[PDB]
C-alpha cells in the first residue's frame, strides 16, 4: 500500500503552485531590473566542499547534511546551500578572475534539521551573490534589492532589517577575552560607509552585535531580514581563495522561499493568481471530437496568451459546464453537431450567462473582447 | 581545489539566458492547454521507485542514487517524475474521481555513463493526465508536444514513433505483439492514429518500441531526432492505467510523458544557430565624483519604477569613465546615464547613447521618457 512523502519534503499541489509562480515572477523581474544574471548549479557536490567552505565546526556540516558514498566511493553531499556551490563553479569556469559577476539562483536546498512550521528538510532558496566589489556600496545595492521585493510583494510593513559587522580573523582572535570592539578601522569604516548609504536610501535598519550566522565564510558585512527570518547573507571575501581561486571580494544573501510565500499569504490574505483556465471548450455529439480539437488549436494559434482547456471523455453539458466552472473558466465555447454543420460555435459568458452563436472565423475576436 | 561531480553540469550566465527563453515558450504552450504545474520532492523512498518502475529495468537495477537516512530509511534521488506525481496524487487525494492536467519541471538523477544527451543529473519537463481513458487525451498530449516544436522552430528536426503494448494479459500471452493486443487496446490505438491523421501529425508505428519502465499499457511513444548517436529521443511517454492502483490509490486511467530539457536546448541551438537572449543590461549607470554614490543609486531606484521592463545596472567600484563605458559595453548596455558632480547639483543626467556615441544632458524628470524612446 501507500508510500508517503519523506518527512520534511513537500508537495506543492496545483493551487499552491500558482501563487508561487506569481511571486517567483515578481522576484525574478526585480532581479532583472538590477542587471543580475541567473546561474544554475548542481544539486549534489563532493562533501569536502561544504566541509571546507562552510566549516567543520558548523552545526550544518556536523549534524545537518545529507551525505552518501557514490558507487566509485566518493563522499557526496546534497547541497544545504548554494554559495559554496557558486564559488566552486565560479573558480572552475573562471568567471571570477578580476571579473565582476552579479548572479542569482533558485532551487531546492537540503538540511537534516527537525521539521518546524518555517523549517523543512527540502526547502527552497532564491539567492544572490556578487563577485569583484569590495566597498559597502555594493552591499547597499543588495539590501536595496531585497527592499524592492518587499515593496513589490506588499510586505514592507512586516520585514525588518538587522545589520552587523565582524571584521575578520584578527577582530576575533584578538577579541577572544571576555562586541566587535576590536574591528580594525577599515571595518568600522566599511560598515559605517554602508550604514550611511542605507540611510540616504531611507531604509530603516537596526544594528545588533548579538547577530551571528551559522556559516563560517562571512567577513565584514552581515545581515538578516526578520519577520514580526526570511532572508540573510553577508560578505565572504576570502572564500574564493579559501577554495582554490584567486581571492576576490564577494557578498550575497539567500531567501527562504517557503517563508516568503507564507508571509506574503499572511500580509495579503487576498493575494490570488490567475485562473488556470480562461476558456473551456465544450462539445457533445458524435464526431465532434476532431472538430473540437481542431477548433481548439485554431483558437490557440489566434489567441496565444489565453488558457483554453478542451473537455475530453464526453460528459453531458451540465457536467462540462460544471468542469469549466471548476477551473475558473470565464467563457465556454460550445461546439455541438449543429455548430459543426453551421460553421459556428456557441460562446457562453459564464459570468453573465449570455450566450451567442458565432461564425467560427469570428469567435477569436469575439473571445478577445469578452476576455477583455 | 574541488570540481563538479562528473555528469553534473553548471549553467553559466550566458547559457542560463537561453534556457529561460526556451522554458518560457514551453510554459506558455502548457498554459494554452489549461494545464497546471505541480512540484514534488527530489528525494523519495526507494520502494516507490522499485514498485512503480519495476525491478527488472535498468533504472532500478543499476541507475538509482539510493542512500540511507539518519534512521535507517532507504532514500532515493528521483530518476523520473511520474512515480512521485502519483505518490502525491494519492497522498493528497487529488486523483480520486478527478481529472488533473499536470506538468512539472526539475532535476532527475540516473547513474549512467556521461555522454552527449545523458547526464547523471538532468532535467525533465513532464506532463501527466489523470482520469481520461479514451484516446482523445492521448491525442492532445501529442498535439501539445507538436505545438512546442512549432513554437521553438524544430518540427523539421523531430519525428514521432507510436505503438500500443496492449494489456498486461495481452503482453503475458506474448511468449510481433500486435497479434496479441486485446480488442479494446487495438481499437483505442486506431482511435489515436485516426486522431493523429485528422490533425496532420505524421507518425511511424514502431512495433519494437520499448520504454525503459514497467508501468506502461496501451499507448507508448517517443519523439526522436536526426539519429543522434545513442541519445536521439527527445521526449517519451505513454499510458499507465494501473499505476495509481498499484501504488495504493483508487484506480484511474493516466497518460503522460517527459522531455529531456538538455536535449531540447541542444536541438534548438543546433537548428537555430542564432537563437538569442536579450542582453542582461540595457542601461548602465556611469557616475563619478564626490558622493555621487548615494545619488546615482537613488536615480537608479527611481528610473526602475518609471521604466518597468528595462534592465539597469549601476556601476560600482569607482573607475574612470573609460573603464565604465567599457563595463557598459561589456554587459551589452545600449545606453548609459552618466551622473557626475555637475548633473547631481543641476538635477540632470547625461544620456549617452552607446550605439551612436552622442549624448545630451537631460533633466532627471524627463530622462525616463528620453531613455524609453531609445530602448524601443
Ligand atoms: N530548513 C529550512 N526551511 C526553510 N528555509 C530555510 C531552511 N534552512 C534555511 N532556510 C532559509 O535560508 C535562509 C538564509 O539563511 S542561510 O541559509 O542560513 N544562509 C545561507 O544559506 C547563505 N548561503 C546565504 C548567502 C549566500 N551568499 C552569501 N550568503 C534563511 O533565512 C531561511 O529562510
Ligand atoms: N540521463 C539523462 N540525461 C539527460 N536526459 C535524459 C536522461 N535520461 C532520460 N533523459 C530524458 O528524459 C526523457 C524521458 O525519460 S524516460 O525515462 O524516457 N520516460 C520517463 O522518464 C517517464 N517518467 C515519462 C512519463 C511520464 N508519464 C508517463 N511516462 C528521455 O526521453 C530523455 O529525453
Key features of this structure:
binds 5'-O-[(L-histidylamino)sulfonyl]adenosine; homodimer; BirA Bifunctional Protein, domain 2; 12 helices; elongated; 372 residues; seven-stranded mixed beta sheet
Given the structure, what is the number of helices of chain A?
12
- Oligomer, anyone? homodimer
Class computed from helices, strands and strand pairing of chain A? alpha+beta
CATH topology name of the largest domain in chain A, in short, is BirA Bifunctional Protein, domain 2
Q: What general form of chain A does the structure show? A: elongated
Q: What is the level 1 CATH name of the largest domain in chain A?
A: Alpha Beta
Order of helices and strands of chain A: HEEHHEEHEEHEHHEEEHEHEHEHEH
Total DSSP E strands of chain A: 14
Subcellular location (chain B): Cytoplasm
InterPro entries (chain B): aa-tRNA-synth_II (IPR006195), aa-tRNA-synth_II/BPL/LPL (IPR045864), Anticodon-bd (IPR004154), Anticodon-bd_dom_sf (IPR036621), His-tRNA-ligase (IPR015807), HisRS-like_core (IPR041715), HisRS/HisZ (IPR004516), HisRS_anticodon (IPR033656)
GO biological process, one term (chain B): histidyl-tRNA aminoacylation
Subunit structure (chain B): Homodimer.
Protein model, in words:
The structure is a homodimer. With 372 residues, chain A is α+β, with helices and mostly antiparallel strands. The first copy, chain A, folds into two domains: 1-273, BirA Bifunctional Protein, domain 2 (2-Layer Sandwich), CATH 3.30.930.10; 274-370, Rossmann fold. Chain A has twelve helices and 14 strands. The first copy, chain A, has helices at 14-33, 48-52, 59-63, 83-92, 137-153, 170-173, 185-200, 257-267, 289-302, 317-327, 337-342, 360-370, and strands spanning 37-38, 44-46, 66-69, 75-78, 101-110, 122-131, 160-162, 222-226, 231-235, 250-256, 279-283, 308-310, 331-335, 346-349. In chain A, the strands form three sheets. In chain A, strands 1-5-6-10-9-8-7 form a seven-stranded mixed sheet. In chain A, strand 8 and strand 9 form a beta hairpin. In chain A, helix 1 runs antiparallel to helix 5 and helix 5 runs parallel beside helix 7 (185-200). Chain A starts with 13 loop residues before the first helix and ends with a helix. At the A-B interface, helix 1, strand 1, strand 2, helix 2 and strand 3 of A face helix 1, strand 1, strand 2, helix 2 and strand 3 of B. Bound molecules: 5'-O-[(L-histidylamino)sulfonyl]adenosine (2 copies). Residues 80-82, 110, 112, 117-119, 122, 124, 126, 128, 212, 233-238, 240, 256-260, 262-263 of chain B line the site of one 5'-O-[(L-histidylamino)sulfonyl]adenosine (HSS). The PDB classes it as ligase. The entry lists the keywords tRNA, aminoacyl-tRNA synthetase, translation, histidyl-tRNA synthetase, aminoacyladenylate analog, Structural Genomics, nppsfa, National Project on Protein Structural and Functional Analyses, RIKEN Structural Genomics/Proteomics Initiative, rsgi, ligase. The assembly is dimeric.
Amino acid at each position: 500500500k501507500n508510500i508517503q512523502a519523506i518527512r520534511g519534503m513537500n508537495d506543492y499541489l496545483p493551487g499552491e503552485t500558482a501563487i508561487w509562480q506569481r511571486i517567483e515572477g515578481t522576484l525574478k523581474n526585480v532581479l532583472g531590473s538590477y542587471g543580475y544574471s541567473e546561474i544554475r548549479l548542481p544539486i549534489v557536490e563532493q562533501t569536502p566542499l561544504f566541509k571546507r567552505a562552510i566549516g567543520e565546526v558548523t552545526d550544518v556540516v556536523e549534524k545537518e547534511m545529507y551525505t552518501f558514498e557514490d558507487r566509485n566511493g566518493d563522499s557526496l553531499t546534497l547541497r544545504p546551500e548554494g554559495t559554496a556551490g557558486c564559488v566552486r563553479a565560479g573558480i572552475e569556469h573562471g568567471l571570477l578572475y578580476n571579473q565582476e559577476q552579479r548572479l542569482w539562483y533558485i532551487g531546492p536546498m537540503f538540511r537534516h534539521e527537525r521539521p518546524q512550521k518555517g523549517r523543512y528538510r527540502q526547502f527552497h532558496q532564491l539567492g544572490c551573490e556578487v563577485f569583484g566589489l569590495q566597498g559597502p556600496d555594493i552591499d547597499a545595492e543588495l539590501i536595496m534589492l531585497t527592499a524592492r521585493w518587499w515593496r513589490a510583494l506588499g510586505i514592507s510593513e512586516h520585514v525588518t532589517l538587522e545589520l552587523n559587522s565582524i571584521g575578520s580573523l584578527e577582530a576575533r582572535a584578538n577579541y577572544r577575552d571576555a562586541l566587535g570592539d576590536y574591528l580594525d578601522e577599515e571595518s568600522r569604516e566599511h560598515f559605517a560607509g554602508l550604514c550611511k548609504l542605507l540611510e540616504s536610501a531611507g531604509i530603516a535598519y537596526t544594528v545588533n552585535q548579538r547577530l551571528v550566522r551559522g556559516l563560517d565564510y562571512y567577513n565584514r558585512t552581515v545581515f538578516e531580514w526578520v519577520t514580526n527570518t526570511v532572508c540573510a547573507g553577508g560578505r565572504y571575501d576570502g572564500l574564493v581563495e579559501q577554495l582554490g581561486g584567486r581571492a576576490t571580494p564577494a557578498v550575497g544573501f539567500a531567501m527562504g522561499l517557503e517563508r516568503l510565500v507564507l508571509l506574503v499569504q499572511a500580509v495579503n490574505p487576498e493575494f490570488k493568481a490567475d485562473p488556470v483556465v480562461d476558456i473551456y471548450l465544450v462539445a457533445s455529439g458524435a464526431d465532434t471530437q476532431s472538430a473540437a480539437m481542431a477548433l481548439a488549436e485554431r483558437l490557440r494559434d489566434e489567441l496565444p496568451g489565453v488558457k483554453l482547456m478542451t473537455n475530453h471523455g464526453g460528459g453531458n453539458f451540465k457536467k462540462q459546464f460544471a468542469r469549466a466552472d471548476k477551473w475558473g473558466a470565464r467563457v465556454a465555447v460550445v461546439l455541438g453537431e449543429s455548430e459543426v454543420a453551421n460553421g459556428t460555435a456557441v460562446v457562453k459568458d459564464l459570468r453573465s450567462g449570455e450566450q451567442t452563436a458565432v461564425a467560427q472565423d469570428s469567435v477569436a475576436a469575439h473571445l478577445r473582447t469578452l476576455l477583455g
